[PDB]
């Protein structure tokens, strides 16, 4: 899910807002992955 991020980053170099929301969604999903698997860490 960072492929879209890198694609728009290379295309522009608007898009930054999409970049930020995708990053936030990815990090939040990772956070809930950690919380769900908190015991086995």
């Amino acid at each position: 899910h960072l492929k879209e991020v890198i694609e728009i980053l290379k295309g522009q170099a608007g898009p930054l807002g999409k970049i930020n929301t995708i990053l936030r969604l990815i990090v939040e999903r990772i956070l809930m992955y950690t919380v769900r698997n908190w015991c086995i860490l």
Binding site: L23, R24, I26, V27, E28, L31, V35, R36, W38, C39
Partner: peptide, 24 residues
């Protein structure tokens, strides 16, 4: 890419950690 958590978000996270510990 670090994200910030509101206080209610912190309560959510810690309650979820408690639930996971209780159930696992």
């Amino acid at each position: 890419s670090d994200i910030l958590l509101n206080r209610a978000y912190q309560k959510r996270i810690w309650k979820a950690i408690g639930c996971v510990i209780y159930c696992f």
